[PDB]
Amino acid sequence: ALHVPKAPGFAQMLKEGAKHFSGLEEAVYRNIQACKELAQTTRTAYGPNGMNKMVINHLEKLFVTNDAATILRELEVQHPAAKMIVMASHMQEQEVGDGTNFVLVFAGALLELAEELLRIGLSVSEVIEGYEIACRKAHEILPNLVCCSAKNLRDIDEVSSLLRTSIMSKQYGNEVFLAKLIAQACVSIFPDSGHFNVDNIRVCKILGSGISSSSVLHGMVFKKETEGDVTSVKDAKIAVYSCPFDGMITETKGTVLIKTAEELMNFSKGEENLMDAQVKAIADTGANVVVTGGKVADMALHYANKYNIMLVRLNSKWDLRRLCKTVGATALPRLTPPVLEEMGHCDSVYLSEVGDTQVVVFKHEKEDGAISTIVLRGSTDNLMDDIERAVDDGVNTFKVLTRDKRLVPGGGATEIELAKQITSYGETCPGLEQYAIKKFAEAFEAIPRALAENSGVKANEVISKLYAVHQEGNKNVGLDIEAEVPAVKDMLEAGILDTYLGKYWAIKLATNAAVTVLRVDQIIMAKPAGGPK
Amino acid sequence: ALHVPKAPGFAQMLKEGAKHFSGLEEAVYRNIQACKELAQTTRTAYGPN
Amino acid sequence: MAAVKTLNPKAEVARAQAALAVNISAARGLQDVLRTNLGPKGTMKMLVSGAGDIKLTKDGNVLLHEMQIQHPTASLIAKVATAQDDITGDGTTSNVLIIGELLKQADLYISEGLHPRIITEGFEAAKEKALQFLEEVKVSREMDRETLIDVARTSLRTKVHAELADVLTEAVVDSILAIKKQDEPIDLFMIEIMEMKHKSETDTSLIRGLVLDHGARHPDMKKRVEDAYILTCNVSLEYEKTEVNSGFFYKSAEEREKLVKAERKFIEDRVKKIIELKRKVCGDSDKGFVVINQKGIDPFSLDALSKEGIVALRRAKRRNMERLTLACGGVALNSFDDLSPDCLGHAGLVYEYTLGEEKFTFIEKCNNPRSVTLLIKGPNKHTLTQIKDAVRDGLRAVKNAIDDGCVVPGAGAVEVAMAEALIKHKPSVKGRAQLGVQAFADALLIIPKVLAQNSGFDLQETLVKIQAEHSESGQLVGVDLNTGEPMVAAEVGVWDNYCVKKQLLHSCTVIATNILLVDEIMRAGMS
Amino acid sequence: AAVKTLNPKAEVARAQAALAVNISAARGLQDVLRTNLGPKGTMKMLVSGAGDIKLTKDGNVLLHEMQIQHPTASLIAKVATAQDDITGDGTTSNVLIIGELLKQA
Amino acid sequence: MMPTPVILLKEGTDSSQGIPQLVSNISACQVIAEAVRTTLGPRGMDKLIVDGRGKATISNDGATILKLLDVVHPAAKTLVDIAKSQDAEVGDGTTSVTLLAAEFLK
Amino acid sequence: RRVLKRDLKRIAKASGATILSTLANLEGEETFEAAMLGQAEEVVQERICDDELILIKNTKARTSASIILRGANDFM
Amino acid sequence: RPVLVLSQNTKRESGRKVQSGNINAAKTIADIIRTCLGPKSMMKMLLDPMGGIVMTNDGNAILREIQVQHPAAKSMIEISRTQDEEVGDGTTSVIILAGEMLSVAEHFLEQQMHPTVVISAYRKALDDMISTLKKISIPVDISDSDMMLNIINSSITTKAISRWSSLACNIALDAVKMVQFEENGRKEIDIKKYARVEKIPGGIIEDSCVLRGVMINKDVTHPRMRRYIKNPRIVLLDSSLEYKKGESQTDIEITREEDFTRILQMEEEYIQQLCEDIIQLKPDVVITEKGISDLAQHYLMRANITAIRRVRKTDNNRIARACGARIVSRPEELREDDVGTGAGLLEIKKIGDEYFTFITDCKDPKACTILLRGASKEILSEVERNLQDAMQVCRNVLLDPQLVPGGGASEMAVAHALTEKSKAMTGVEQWPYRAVAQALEVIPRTLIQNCGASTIRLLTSLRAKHTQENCETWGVNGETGTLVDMKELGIWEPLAVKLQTYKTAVETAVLLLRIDDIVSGHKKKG
């Protein structure tokens, strides 16, 4: 009478390390608690007043940032429900580029309120149906909340003003300068064709001079040196070769069969003459810069130096393709001289040193080109990485604006308006789904609440003021960051705007993740065993 | 499918060192075998020889 | 103790009633776990692997495979369910439930001193009668689109969310009707199932063509060709080494260059054959070639093809040869010795889609494709896996319905009617096998029980309501999962595959009979 | 479970598990003591740790001399002990009726 | 701290937040700064660091001393990074950067 | 194929055949003459308890013998 | 440093203990499978060390899945395997008989009788057992298919396939009949090589059938080839249809620029020449045990020929027997006689989620396949074992047309005959004679015990019945547990099976009675 045996049936047949959780308390409440914990971990990094977190992964690498997706990626999340929410956040990052923290916070609030509803008496099916109805209502409402449109994407000032809000959450203090940089870089790209490519914006991180010294270059920068003696060309005529800069050899097996003394004495001289002829044929087309994707032979280098030809050796084929795009050359597969169509052109190619790193610069004087690069300076590697993350967020925002030009007021104004309208709609709806609809509406309060908490004010006063102001009829009013007391101000005139498409996708994904978590009723976890990767 | 579990009921409730023999082959025949062995051990000392 | 343990001391043995107890306990445990899967109202289970992969599922076979169980009887039942899934593609949870209930009902009499042999005899007699009744009750009907839609709904609603099921029904029915040749067996290999991971779950749809998970490897090839000729070939266009160890011998750099230029003549001949065919077929820029190759293409040949405005794909799947020849309508070529415009397929639109680091090529707007693809879209990997399993079940269900014109009413109506018929037939069975017949009928009654239980209603009261309605009316009334009242499953549209029911009866009876007759479990292969 | 969070080294059987455990123990006791009932019952040999030999078919003696560590077995043993102490008979029938009541329930 | 049956993150994950962790970061920066304090100015001294292999190095240069120190504190490594940055961009003042940063924090 | 050398020698001696490691006469050619052939009255492949073995029955030019022992198991 | 005349690990046991241990080991082996005999037998679950499950009531499988340490048990296992291999039935019977004879021998060994006397009595008994069994046999007309089906039924009434009796009997009879083959004056059956059993889980057992041909788990190499040919002409091959390296080292040396292309073109021309040589016979199906080159596939499709590659050698031999083809290795030596004409249909169809190739309309096929459809793998394995027993019994009857009454009638008849014969010896070995004679009663006794009837009453009645003159065919009904005449019940056994069982049991008893020393632990010294 001192031991409780395992119940007969499945409990006894379970494996040695496996776990089985079933029912509300064992499974659903535990999943909700785990998701709430994850949301709490990421909550403090939300908004302009969000705080960076220094995360060290299993490889002893240091990450400091407030980008929610990066933080979740570097955290070794183990609880499977939190894993599902992290997958939702990563999907939001991949689809849009911003709103990962919104997805996480909204999902956490939804799951918390779902636990509340389950405790007061509702069933899982009713809560799920209520959330689905409320999500449909929110997606219907949102297009009516659009305040203005981009209406121009070739203007530097307009694009910078549009992109300021996206890169104000990260790098709050100095966002105008970064906005101008990213606006110039994006306007260089995005030709008359409506298609915009994110990969056409390259980022080069050169350490030392503070991030205020960063600039935008219409071309590319490679952190390497020239093979030859020539180190500067002012009327570049780049000829790109994907093959090694050496005499091509057979593919099965090549052996030099010598049968007489004369052949032995003439072989090396003939090979050298052939290489010289090939290099001179290349040079006679006017080409003065040669870019090769492979190694450079010594004889080829010597003959290129004789004919005053600049040699650059690109290790990665991705860089070779990007250079071909940005110059206008075709990567030849042999050592044949390039025809006039395949010959690339650039305004200036030269070797230069920035800080203590030698770089090769392919610079265009024109305000155009397929590929543009941003040279990031700074006093720390981590700082430059964070600035690069902010640049990526801004570029993704520009891409979204190209896809959809509609914008909604930021600073929690859209969330408060959505909450108010969904609460109004849910009151008219009878049945047991009204509780779920009202909780879905209330879950939108977590965004202004997080903003107010991070700004250091009382969230409740801010939310009450927002409801009041939206009650008179101002739907473009959000909280004011630059105030020590809870206060609100108009966001349309302040320019604090976030993309409509981002909000739409974030709401959809967060709702889907919360519903998917709620649908689970049993968990059968296998023995963790190993799995290093 | 690599181990035969103990049958539910008295088999599982038995103590770790305890033994339970039931039925003809398990109990009666074993007892008869033990008695036969004992009689065999004592057999050779019977009688004057 | 036993003979085996006497001969082999490190052996585990269960004898006589112990074997029955062990097997019945294992069956009861499996049934207790799988009770909650049955029906569209069943609960969704979450499975985490050792590596941490998350799988949301409701399928009985999928759940059984991902169980953390090492029981022998569980292994036997899992094998039976695996066979059921392999052939019919549905009814795994019903299989497990019926086996477990058969064993429980048999034990209910065996514990009263009755021998298992009599129970098995009753089981086989009841199975014969039940098969006769199922033959009587099936609804032979020519199946237009509506009946197939109803069957696909009856499967997918049980597998996934209602709205996702509504989308998947149209998808699966249209695909099956597209690939179905007249009075010919349906080849399910001709429906490619492709997963993309960017849109929502309801964005999955049907493409009247083909989708390939790879794209052109040359940046200069066209990303979208409006009018396209299709060349499906199985010819390697990359460099090939001679089988008999050739090696090259030269005495000068010029000779080496000559040998290098002349070592690609063999491949260049085939490339120029393709180029000549393309120039003969289309002399303008309106049309174009898409060359899908099962074998690789080296960069030289890719460049030579791109110079002529030809898009080429390499390393295609083996099944894609048949799929393209059935969709585009060309001829798969293993050599270019005699290639003519008549062997070229056609496609009304070919374009490439980029998703992250993966390329997808769409071959659609075909004339009358006999092979289509089901593009599965979702935000999560586990969502994609769940949709893929549901689509497999729906495809199997629709194909099964097409195979035989009959279809069986669902919602447990058929089991209720079968149980009533068995009870009526019970007096005709001579001897104590009437006990086995009664046990078989009660075991068949498990499906409405579990359906009503999962729907939240009372079990016994709902079942007696259904049985009373069926007895007084004679109709095939099932369980209405919304109200618990009797409902005519035929009129509403809750249909079940006749082959699935027949397989359930046969396999469940066979495995239950075999298990009941087992009187010893041995593990003595060690040492 | 809730209890296992406060005390990690705690064994808990909850909901249908408790019924399954109790009924399984009762059925085991019943299966052992079925053979005792009636004059046609079977002798049982009871060998102690010290090697003492007891031959009996009494329900209470057998219950006290089996090697069982089950809670439900302990409860049934207490009930049978009270039955024996007051009336002196019916212990085997006591266990049988309890087990059959639980099984039928 | 109620022990959840399944913990959120990996076991052994250490998290410190709030004012105390920032104060600890400031203290760590102070510790890094005081290791190069005496090497400033015409009266500065030299530091000798012996690695695991036993090969000693002697330097008056702040960046060299900081690199030879196996700094693992995440907040302290920023001072080493800015010392390297000052060495790269300018080449002199690798002690002044660390002293100024730590003094700001203090 | 893979006939044991001792078995082949016994068969050749009993049947009058000659072992030929190679086909090469004293004229430098490659030939096989009929005089190098053994003879037997019957060659069969009989079945002995789920297995098969070849019996060369009644060889000529010399009488040989073999014994097939049938038991209950391998040890016997 | 001990002297150690023998090795340290060497153990010696001798005397009465060795004999008692051997006899007890044999008794234990018998008791393992005692309950698996008769129509009312119960199945057993065997857990394979590799993780599989063997669920059967066949004696040989049960004994084969058991690992034992006592060498007498190993001898008994080998006896079971020998009985299974020789005739394919009577495994449980021979094990039980050996155990019983060893018990009744231990009875005498306990007294002062030397084992040689017991062995001599056993051998005399075995001779008289054989004589009586041959005496009480009856002939069989093999032409009568009904009697053959009845014999197969009587063989399979005690297996799990007994529920589907007529189906299994017809399958086994047809398979044996059309695998029967005679050539060069030599007759053979060869159930082992031909008459393949292919089991596909799923479907229903009633759908099982034996095909007038063969079926393999293969598909066409290229989808353009036909999957349904009406009257195909099949050509079989062994050599690959692809360019291959030579046996000798054959390095080439290329100095002219056009030699590389020339060599590749010669490879293609060689493939084309091989395909043309094959096409010259105008076949429709080509089967190869090795690979087929893709260019070869193109050249064959140009001639409208279906090609299948990588077929197992056993499957290819079965196809050759079924369709009357001859496997050839060099296509240039292909002859008209080698082309397989006689297959009446070739069809590749999908079963479940897999392709299967059918050659299933052969006229007069000398090989066949048995397609088993069932609930799972274990059920199909047991069905295959039962059907193998049925085919072995059918082959035994075809070779030896003698029958013997079953249900223990033969055991009681032989026991009575030997008991009557023992009345005249008046020696010292009459007692072991009579003991081993009455040891045969363990078969009817086991049948009664498994049936559940009273053993003593039924055996007494059976012995009294057999004491009469014309009662040799009176045995025990396995279901009702009543004494019935076996010419009325219809259960009969091949004389070969009974003879093999009796011989093997007696010889096992002789072998184990002969041992009195056991030494163990010595090194292999290979």
Ligand SMILES: Nc1ncnc2c1ncn2[C@@H]1O[C@H](COP(=O)(O)OP(=O)(O)O)[C@@H](O)[C@H]1O
């Ligand atoms: N100047 C500002 N004043 C008030 N709110 C702002 C301001 N800039 C940004 N926000 C708010 O911050 C939110 C963005 O938070 P962020 O850290 O970017 O999370 P995520 O990256 O997940 O979008 C937006 O909802 C926006 O309304």
Ligand SMILES: Nc1ncnc2c1ncn2[C@@H]1O[C@H](COP(=O)(O)OP(=O)(O)O)[C@@H](O)[C@H]1O
């Ligand atoms: N809409 C419905 N209303 C009532 N019963 C249904 C409905 N849909 C399905 N059913 C019944 O529920 C059962 C679903 O079984 P399912 O969960 O698919 O088990 P399995 O996966 O093993 O086939 C079917 O037998 C069917 O008769």
Ligand SMILES: Nc1ncnc2c1ncn2[C@@H]1O[C@H](COP(=O)(O)OP(=O)(O)O)[C@@H](O)[C@H]1O
């Ligand atoms: N001679 C008899 N014939 C028929 N039944 C009997 C006879 N003697 C006793 N019984 C029944 O058998 C039962 C014996 O129970 P018993 O073994 O005494 O259990 P307990 O010791 O727990 O009372 C009694 O209930 C009695 O009714």
Ligand SMILES: Nc1ncnc2c1ncn2[C@@H]1O[C@H](COP(=O)(O)OP(=O)(O)O)[C@@H](O)[C@H]1O
């Ligand atoms: N219908 C029947 N009635 C009585 N005895 C039968 C019947 N069918 C078979 N038998 C007996 O059962 C025995 C067959 O047992 P079986 O399980 O086949 O053992 P084995 O596999 O060793 O032959 C035979 O000796 C036969 O005489």
Ligand SMILES: [Mg+2]
């Ligand atoms: Mg953001």
Ligand SMILES: [Mg+2]
């Ligand atoms: Mg289903």
Ligand SMILES: [Mg+2]
């Ligand atoms: Mg009493």
Ligand SMILES: [Mg+2]
């Ligand atoms: Mg200085």
Ligand SMILES: [Mg+2]
């Ligand atoms: Mg047999």
